[PDB]
Amino acid sequence: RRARRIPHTAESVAFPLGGIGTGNVSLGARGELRDWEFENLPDKGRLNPRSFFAIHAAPQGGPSATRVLEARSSGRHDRDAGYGFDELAGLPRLDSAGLHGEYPVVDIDFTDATLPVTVSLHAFTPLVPLDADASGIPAAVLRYRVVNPGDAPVTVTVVGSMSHTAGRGAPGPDAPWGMRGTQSVRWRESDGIRGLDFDIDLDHDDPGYGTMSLTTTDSSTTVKPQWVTSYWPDGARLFWNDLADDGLLAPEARLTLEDKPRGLFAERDADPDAPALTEEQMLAKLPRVRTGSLGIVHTLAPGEERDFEFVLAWSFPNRRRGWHGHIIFDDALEDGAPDLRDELGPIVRNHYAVRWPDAWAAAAQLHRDLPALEGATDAFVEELYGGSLDPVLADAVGANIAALRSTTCFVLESPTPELGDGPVFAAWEGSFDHGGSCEGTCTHVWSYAQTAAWLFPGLERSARRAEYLLETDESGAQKFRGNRIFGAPRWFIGPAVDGQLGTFLRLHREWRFCGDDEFLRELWPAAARTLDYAAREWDHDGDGLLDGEMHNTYDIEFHGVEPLSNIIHLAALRAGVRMAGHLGDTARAQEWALRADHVAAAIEGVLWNGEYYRQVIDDVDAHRYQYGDGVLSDQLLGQFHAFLGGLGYLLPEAHVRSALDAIVQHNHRGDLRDHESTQRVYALNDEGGLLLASWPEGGRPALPFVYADEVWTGIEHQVAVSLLFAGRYDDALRIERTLRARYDGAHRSPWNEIECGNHYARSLASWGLLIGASGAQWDAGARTLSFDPVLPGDARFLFTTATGWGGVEIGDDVITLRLHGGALDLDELRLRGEVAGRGIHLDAGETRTLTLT
Amino acid sequence: SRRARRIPHTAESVAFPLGGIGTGNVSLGARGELRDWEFENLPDKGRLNPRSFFAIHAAPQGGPSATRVLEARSSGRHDRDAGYGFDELAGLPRLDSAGLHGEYPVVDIDFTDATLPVTVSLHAFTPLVPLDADASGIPAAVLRYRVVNPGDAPVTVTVVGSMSHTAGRGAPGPDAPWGMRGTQSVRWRESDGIRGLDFDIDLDHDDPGYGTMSLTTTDSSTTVKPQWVTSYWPDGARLFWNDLADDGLLAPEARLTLEDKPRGLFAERDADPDAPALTEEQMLAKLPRVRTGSLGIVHTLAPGEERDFEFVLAWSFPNRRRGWHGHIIFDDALEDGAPDLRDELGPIVRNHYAVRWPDAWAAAAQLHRDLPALEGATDAFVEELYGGSLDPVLADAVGANIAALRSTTCFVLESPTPELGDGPVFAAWEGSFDHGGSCEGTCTHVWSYAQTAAWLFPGLERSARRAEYLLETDESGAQKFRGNRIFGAPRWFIGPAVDGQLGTFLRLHREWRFCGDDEFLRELWPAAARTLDYAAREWDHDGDGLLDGEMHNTYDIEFHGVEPLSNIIHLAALRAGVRMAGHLGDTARAQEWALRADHVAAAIEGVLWNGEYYRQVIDDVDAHRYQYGDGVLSDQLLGQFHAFLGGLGYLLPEAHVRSALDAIVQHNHRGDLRDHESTQRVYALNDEGGLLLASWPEGGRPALPFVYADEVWTGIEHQVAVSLLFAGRYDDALRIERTLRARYDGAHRSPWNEIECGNHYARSLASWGLLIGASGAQWDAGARTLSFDPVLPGDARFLFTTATGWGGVEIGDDVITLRLHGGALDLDELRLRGEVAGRGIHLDAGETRTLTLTL
Ligand SMILES: [Cl-]
Ligand SMILES: [Mg+2]
Ligand SMILES: [Mg+2]
Ligand SMILES: [Mg+2]
Ligand SMILES: [Mg+2]
Ligand SMILES: [Mg+2]
Ligand SMILES: [Mg+2]
Ligand SMILES: [Mg+2]
Ligand SMILES: [Mg+2]
Ligand SMILES: [Mg+2]
Ligand SMILES: [Mg+2]
Ligand SMILES: [Mg+2]
Ligand SMILES: [Mg+2]
Ligand SMILES: [Mg+2]
Ligand SMILES: [Mg+2]
Ligand SMILES: [Mg+2]
């Protein structure tokens, strides 16, 4: 296998299935399902009762074997009440496993000393670049490949057993058995698929309502649609008895073995010769989760390999209207915007529910379209992980896509009439284990996130329209957390300099990617105002440099004069000139171009110290949370945006390189055992990482900004991307190797970079590594595509554009474009600053090799 | 040189619990970290106490200083969802490694580090004084850091404890800003011969969440920051570390907040933007409500010098909400009969320890003032339990499991019900979930397994027997197996369990035999005798003397047919009944019971014995769910465990008892569980071993056997190993114990926490019987006789207890020595291996007597 084998003992490792906005379930390195979080909230560590795969292998004329299809557990076994009944941890398992993840696809290869067959699991949820719907199906393929390496036929049953997740409620008389409603399960065969269809009797508009399914297209099935529900776990024992007996299953004659509540379960007030309860009446007194099993049965010849293919699908269509987070409280709202919530009502739907209002619909789609969906997914994996990128960089780019497809992000169906009809992308900053982290598609965080802008640009556009149409007032003040997507009044807190101007940079990015001038024009009156706001409101001494108190991503305000704000502003001005001039807004184009030149001069005159850019302040201790002559890792965040936006260097190339080099030299730690931090920990011990700031020349405040001693993968990524554009390949690679080692499975999961929450949005800065490594520059307005790889010689990269995606392959004398999705109609193709092709058009499925001479 | 085997700092499960009987607890991990902060009348495994940690500043003369948290480095998962948070101070430098050496109640944690210019060890304990439940119930612990200077220059060392109070948390909402329903306080205090930090909270004194804490020393060489800065951001910790790492000295903060008014993200929406600053007091009212302080002790160590930096951590949460408030005995499960006193009695029951000690400081002051005697007793205990002849495996099993008795699982109430009169009453959960009690009501079917308190704190067990007989036993002799009436509530409506009810009667005999108090027995005797007669009357439907048909038991199901668990317990109960009846002059009842017992033993042999073991006789093992038939039930001879411990000897032919025990071992013990198939709960798995509850070596497995048959319970493992020691099957006892304790050797589970339905599970207290069976200790307080009969020949040395006193017994063929460490002992006879060693032996604490044995 190409991916690195992660052993079954790496307990943190979780490979997430599910798509954009769908919610998720993960596979651990034991091959177990974990982190069941379908229900519009995170739920790391949620155990789904009785939900597992199992194998019965019956060698012809030989003893049978029956195992759960999981490697052995390891680690702490001191659960407070033991592993519970519903975990079935006492059933026999496979000795070991290795997990090989190339997100969105995983392979988990099992090893066992005695099982008479060998097993692997291939799993994925499709990902189709530029197709957010196809990439947002609430379902996953679970495909178990079984090999008979023995000399006699083996009859193999692979059986998924599953419980629906819906229905939990807080303990109480409205939630007997912790369940607010009662589940159902049945066998179903319709829509070209067969299997188990789960439901619940909650109201159609209850936020907790949802469905699940476990299906196959395999005709060779054996089923127990509904396990027995008794007070004791009879269901499970009967299931195992049924499976290990013969590798076949039957429906249960009786759905409960209780006649009436007795012994410990007796109702104190029951009439002791009440009439017999019907089974339905007895079921009404019992636990409300339901479980079924779908088995697929094949006799494998000596040597034969066969796939046992399932789909697991789910649908929780209803969200409560509002973030219901921990920041934007209904008493932290400012007056001024109409409160639409009573009129619009208490629910907003997930977008995915328009096509797939229940699990069956999603399953049926995934099975019907599997060749194309899988074909796309596989082409994506091959381009992303099978080209010339160093494996570390492919890992950083690819694995972090998981954040975009996690509970951190979601897509709402028409949440507010003010944006018109259609999907609106919105996101937390991250996911706490059990709730959202930091609501409002936070602009100072999300400005670092690049992945969606290149893979699902539609989503990012929908978000920019919320910020400009709803969250930007007449003066140009833009909220950095948005509440108006729900119809709710705005958050009362004011603008952040990085969030407001980062948003403006993202408007440029979005427009550059799609080429849609109408998109830009709609947002332009508000966007221009936000750029004007900065020079007017944030420069108190009229020198062109933003100064004094401005709020930033560090949750504090910087004072004095300093590069984070100023270099972002410089980039925004440059972007603003491009957009203004294109749109014919000649007054702003001129005004901003003058301003930009003046700012760049003033940055070099004031903030540059001959090695890096730093904060000019009278007294670094006069206000808490400053940094002064410290080296701020984000000093050049503006330049990261500029490189990615095709704006090149904002400042003298040698000065930018010096500054980057200072960041690497001073702020990168190979080992953190001696680091003296009172802050949050995302790197420690024998790990390394880029610090947010350090003070190599002294001047450390008593109380520096409150995250200065921390390590943020997002900042690591942005700096590495800048280093790539600057030609500092070795250092970018070292940053990325070091940070991804913290996420190699030993202590943290590859598919979950963390900050304030799991699947943290800043981690999506990582996509810029592909861009920087390849020097990809797509301008949809010019219809030009160019590459300029940092490393010389032969190369092969994934690329995206608005209209199409594929692979680029570069040699001495030729460049090849192969398109896997959509279409490409280039005015011009450039390689290393030279014209490689004019008028170059390709359709999906076509390859063109162009001579460079 | 440490006697306990070294547990590495990488063993994440390991937690050495400080605290005493009924006090609540905090634990030490193998990194030397404090963890599992659970002082407040409920379990709380995994609760992190913000800003609560020890650190060292080591300033070598003429060398670079080192400032470190006095913990080894963490080593497992680091993927906390938000990172390690500010208040964990996980980004401060730590030590390369540590080795934990626990001989409960004492622990030593030895740090190793390549950069620190001194070497550090932590010695910690909460005193344990056998037979003194109060002295063993101090809500405090000693934390004594030994620092050695192995280098070549003097080093000025500061060892600093920083600590937050735990009190005040509230459910999310407007009255719990920052998650805190009250505001804590901390101050420097010097009083009662001690000094340090005194923590309080502005909750009402009767609030269940009210309490205090203290961190004190008697060292005069202190440096202190009594109250860290409270700002919106964690300025306090930054200032703390700047202050420590600068010079190893601390100062009080001139400003208790660095906020002038709420600003920025914390600004109040409606505030006037140019509002003036608030006072410091008004500003603190708007800020987080936990308070932190730091007590440092400073000494300069010459090359080769060592010094103790001694702290005491103490706490007090005096108030419990009246009632179990568990998950079984809800209002819809309450019986009409006994009237509801709850409204008449008032909403709070106090912890017993809160009678003696008003607050944390009081308990700290006691512990410091009395420390030489308390520690002396504790050290003498440790030496007898762990420094004698027992195989270390056995000493481990006996001593580690005491933790359960001193955990949140158990507590002691001040006078919860007028119906028992005034005084402390012991009560217990079966266990402790991570964040709540497991299975309320001093459950009798579970607690009948527990032996530790009956030998170490018998008074506690007597107080509980009174609740059962006076409160939970009706006029027919039906006894509840979960007791709600201690709180003045109606009884639970569920009826008796055969093992619970008869197990409690066996424990009455046990308690009476230990103490020799006929008045204790007489008060309970009418109720107790009715509970024994209840069995033969109500549970034998075919007149054969054997209990038959539907009887509920510890497996939470009912056995049908006729089967040994019930019947061999009954046999044992009858034999104990005869002793008690005979002594009290209830001569007619003694005779009746003796003859009934003779008939029961004969019927057991004639019906339940199959030539190899005892089993369930039933027409169809599948006619009723949850049976076992011809399976081997590990608990078949539980009655015989009681009988052995109660001095009653073999209940059945010796060869048959040994055969059955051998069959339990042979059939139900597993060295490895890779091949095991269980749809049940997991307490043992994979490459572990254990004793299964049942197995079917000759077939006859029901489709749905009892619901725990395929499980492994340490309590059952212990009871069987105890019986095996009595029966002379030492090797097999040791094997069961070796295998079970290996499950709790720190690799996957903690030595100090055997688990079943909950942490610190009461059944694990069967482990005390290993000492009794290994030593063959037989104490009869009514006869004033003490005998030993060790399973292994030759020289031996054991802990022993009696009602009046405790100590060490040293045995050879030439002499037997008693050394009494506490109390007194007045023996009419001392016997060894059935022979009189001496008569008229009178010892006081601190004395020894060595008797030469006859040739
Ligand atoms: Cl899109
Ligand atoms: Mg959790
Ligand atoms: Mg349905
Ligand atoms: Mg079958
Ligand atoms: Mg200025
Ligand atoms: Mg490591
Ligand atoms: Mg075509
Ligand atoms: Mg075309
Ligand atoms: Mg917990
Ligand atoms: Mg006080
Ligand atoms: Mg100082
Ligand atoms: Mg009866
Ligand atoms: Mg009978
Ligand atoms: Mg082994
Ligand atoms: Mg192991
Ligand atoms: Mg000798």
Author numbering:
A (entry chain A): 3 to 855
B (entry chain B): 2 to 856
Tell me what the authors wrote about this structure, in their words:
In this study, we identified four enzymes (two GH183 endo-d-arabinanases, GH172 exo-α-d-arabinofuranosidase, and GH116 exo-β-d-arabinofuranosidase) from Microbacterium arabinogalactanolyticum. These enzymes completely degraded the complex d-arabinan core structure of lipoarabinomannan and arabinogalactan in a concerted manner. Furthermore, through biochemical characterization using synthetic substrates and X-ray crystallography, we elucidated the mechanisms of substrate recognition and anomer-retaining hydrolysis for the α- and β-d-arabinofuranosidic bonds in both endo- and exo-mode reactions. We propose a d-arabinan-degrading pathway for Mi. arabinogalactanolyticum based on its gene cluster and four characterized enzymes.
The crystal structures of ExoMA2 were determined at 1.75 and 1.35 Å resolutions for the complex forms with Tris (buffer molecule) and β-d-Araf, respectively. The two structures are almost identical (Cα RMSD < 0.19 Å for all chain pairs), and we will mainly describe the complex structure with β-d-Araf. A dimer is present in the asymmetric unit of the ExoMA2 crystal, consistent with the SEC measurement in solution and the PISA server prediction. ExoMA2 has a two-domain structure consisting of N-terminal β-sandwich and C-terminal (α/α)6 barrel domains, the latter being the catalytic domain. The two-domain structure resembles that of GH116 β-glucosidase from Thermoanaerobacterium xylanolyticum (TxGH116, Dali Z score = 42.4 and Cα RMSD = 2.5 Å), whereas the amino acid sequence identity is very low (21%). Compared with TxGH116, ExoMA2 has an additional long loop and a small β-sandwich domain in the N-terminal and C-terminal domains, respectively. In contrast, GH172 αFFase1 (anomer-retaining α-d-Araf-ase)17 initially produced α-d-Araf. This finding indicated that ExoMA2 is an anomer-retaining GH.
